[PDB]
């Protein structure tokens, strides 16, 4: 009966009181996704002379 | 991957040879409790309940096993080594 | 089910403070503990045959 | 009343299931509530990076921080091309944006009753093994069925074939059938390379047996067993066969499991257990030329066939205490018997078995899920 | 069922073990491996150690 | 084998999602009875299943 | 004080609660005195300051 | 410029968008606040009697 | 503070490891008595 409901939703489980709430709800993987370079074609054709 | 082989086995194919071989341990734990049922009286073993009567049952598989245990245990235990 | 592989063991027994002062280096911290008022053996868990 | 048992049941076995081991499982420690979260790094140029904090190479402020969205006209690019003045001083500034992402995880079970009778007095023994066999095989096809159907629910891309614009619009009947055509795997081809969709596979090429073919498909589509015939049929843009056999191509190649062939650029995967909208479709009125229809609330309705397409990296399986495998089954016994009688049964002659398991899912990127809508013939 | 020591690193977690036959090297020569794992944790893998 | 008759019998099991399995020991997930005991048939419906 | 629980798994699954998620902590105790010599027993009433 | 700004009490971080918050506001001590027995002082005088 | 260890087990825990094996031992002592 002592339940967790949810935290989230604007409920509260049994243990906590009118004051509190529970400090951890969600997990992070600290580990974001990148988008890589696009790749250049044009670049390597050119020829480099000295100014 | 822990190591250098070159076909490396993963758990999950491990946990795949557990899965394959539970079912027959399973259903061959039954009968190894059944027959610990028969040894101490519970389960099956044990008498129905009935207000007027009775609920006694003497122990044969208990007694019948009693003398084995002794008999089989000392041999090991007859002298002060134990290989040779 | 083996004696060698258990981690703990706890044992409660009666003693007098002279036990405790035959080697005082051993123990500490004896003035705190009453040595005057309380006078019966009454405490419930540990089971002895003293009157 | 005296017959002679063969003791020798008839027994089938377990659906394969494809969908479930492309899944990758990412742990969830306990203690953290039932909710992952992650970021996402948008790049400077793309369109997604929204910002007030753009000054342009005249000193001003502009509405947008990024100097040129995703767009490819020249014109737009010149317009728009960050330039400095030799007492250059505050000429351009940028900015970048984080988003964020968040799945989480639901609960499953069910169980079932025997009695002692049951165990004991029937002829046929092993009545056990049997009941614990067919229980397993429903759970693994049910969290299959679960993932197959939050796949295609969760799909980014998706293609209606034809001329519909909707489920409701896809239909067989008319001038415009609703069927896949060639052209509709080249843009589905075409959309995913745009994508930047890695390839899972390599171009096969030719072997020194005769009547052997070539075959360049680098990606995986899988169909169910209903658009079979009606792939077999097709004919390519020329007018020529399209459906290339698995015997051709047999030798230098490895045939993966369930393979029917390969069109353009996708191998055909055959999945047993692929799931169909049913009644999705248009209503079918009589001049149905052959194509499977269904009942709702009296009408006939066309039906409607998934085809999926999944790229790499695309979602992993979040698990709860779930072991090395993207799920984990937790069952119990009750044996029936008087000694569990204390409180509920005085008799206590009535045993169970209950089986359950967490399940769920996140999508990492969903623009590499693809997907195309079609009909599919009698 | 719910004996818990306060020190973490005295706690008891069941963990598992794997003795078999395995062909390591794909050759079709099959050698005695052992793996033990805990959890979803593959925390050592290798060749059998006795003779 | 003799003095059984001439005839033979096998038993062949049903597994549980088939439409076959017409039986009377369903409970939903509310509490209540439920017509069919198998969750679902051999019908693939998304709507259905879900 | 003699403290039974029964923390959730197989050994709180029941009939009427199939799975088991459930759990209970008690705690009970017994309780009596006699007096042999009340007369050494004293007390004052008296009421006493805010 | 990109500012910490207040992201409690709403007032989002100047790099995080309109879909994402910053992940974590708070640092938690995990060593909770608890309160000692009472003493007894009744309870050493009494002794104990089976029956 | 005792001893000159760098992790000292305090009473805490020893009362805390005896309230915790306790009970078994509990319904124990009844088989013997």
């Not at chain 2, 007694?63 to 245990?73: D, I, K, P, V």
């Not at chain 4, 659906?15 to 953290?32: C, D, G, I, R, W």
Request: glycine share 8%; aromatic share 10%; net charge neutral.
């Amino acid at each position: 009966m002592l339940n967790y409901n949810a935290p989230t939703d604007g409920q509260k489980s049994s243990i906590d009181g009118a004051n509190s709430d529970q400090m951890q709800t969600f997990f992070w993987l600290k580990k974001a996704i990148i988008t890589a370079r696009k790749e250049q074609y044009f670049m390597p054709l050119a020829s480099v002379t000295n100014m | 991957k822990l190591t250098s082989w070159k076909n490396e086995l993963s758990l999950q194919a491990l946990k795949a040879d557990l899965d394959a071989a539970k079912p027959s341990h399973t259903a061959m734990m039954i009968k190894v409790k059944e027959w610990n049922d028969l040894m101490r009286i519970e389960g099956k073993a044990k008498p129905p309940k009935v207000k007027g009567r009775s609920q006694v049952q003497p122990k044969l598989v208990r007694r019948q096993a009693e003398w084995r245990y002794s008999a089989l245990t000392e041999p090991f235990l007859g002298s002060n080594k134990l290989f040779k | 089910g083996d004696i060698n592989k258990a981690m703990f063991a706890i044992v409660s027994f009666e003693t007098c403070k002279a036990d405790l002062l035959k080697e005082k280096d051993r123990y500490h911290n004896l003035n705190k503990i009453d040595w005057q008022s309380s006078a019966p053996v009454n405490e419930p868990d540990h089971a002895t045959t003293t009157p | 009343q005296t017959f002679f048992w063969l003791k020798k049941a008839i027994i089938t076995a377990r659906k394969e299931q494809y969908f479930m081991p492309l899944a990758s499982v990412t742990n969830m420690p306990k203690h953290y509530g039932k909710t992952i979260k992650v970021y996402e790094y948008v790049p400077l140029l793309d369109d997604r990076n929204i910002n007030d904090q753009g000054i342009d190479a005249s000193g001003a402020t502009i509405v947008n921080g990024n100097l040129y969205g995703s767009s490819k006209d020249i014109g737009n690019i010149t317009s728009k091309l960050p330039l400095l003045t030799e007492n250059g001083g505050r000429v351009n500034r940028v900015g970048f944006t984080r988003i964020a992402r968040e799945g989480s995880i639901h609960k499953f079970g069910f169980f079932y009753e025997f009695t002692q009778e049951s165990i004991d007095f029937d002829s046929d023994d092993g009545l056990m093994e049997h009941l614990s066999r067919e229980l397993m095989n429903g759970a693994t096809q049910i969290t299959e069925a679960v993932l197959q159907k939050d796949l295609l629910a969760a799909a980014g891309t998706v293609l209606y074939a034809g001329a519909a614009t909707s489920d409701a619009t896809i239909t067989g009947e008319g001038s415009t059938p609703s069927v896949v055509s060639y052209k509709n795997l080249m843009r589905l081809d075409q959309i995913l390379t745009e994508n930047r969709t890695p390839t899972q596979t390599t171009i096969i090429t030719g072997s020194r047996m005769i009547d052997t073919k070539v075959i360049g498909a680098t990606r995986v589509m899988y169909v169910g067993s209903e658009l079979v015939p009606e792939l077999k049929a097709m004919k390519d843009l020329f007018g020529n066969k399209a459906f290339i056999e698995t015997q051709h191509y047999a030798d230098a190649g490895t045939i993966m499991n369930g393979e029917v062939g390969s069109i353009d650029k996708f191998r055909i995967i055959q999945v047993p257990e692929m799931l169909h909208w049913a009644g999705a479709g248009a209503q079918a009125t009589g001049a149905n030329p052959g194509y499977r229809t269904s009942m709702v609330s009296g009408q006939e309705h066309y039906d409607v066939y998934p085809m999926l397409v999944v790229g790499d990296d695309s979602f992993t399986s979040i698990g709860f205490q779930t072991d090395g495998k993207s799920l984990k089954f937790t069952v119990m016994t009750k044996m029936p018997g008087k000694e569990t009688a204390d409180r509920n049964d005085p008799y206590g002659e009535t045993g169970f078995s209950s089986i359950k398991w967490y399940y769920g899912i996140l999508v990492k990127r969903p623009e590499r899920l693809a997907l195309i809508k079609t009909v599919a013939p009698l | 069922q719910e004996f818990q020591i306060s020190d973490p690193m005295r706690k008891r977690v069941v963990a598992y073990e794997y003795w078999g036959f395995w062909d390591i090297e794909g050759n079709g020569v099959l050698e005695p491996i052992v793996a033990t794992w805990i959890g979803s944790t593959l925390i050592r893998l290798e060749k059998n150690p006795y003779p």
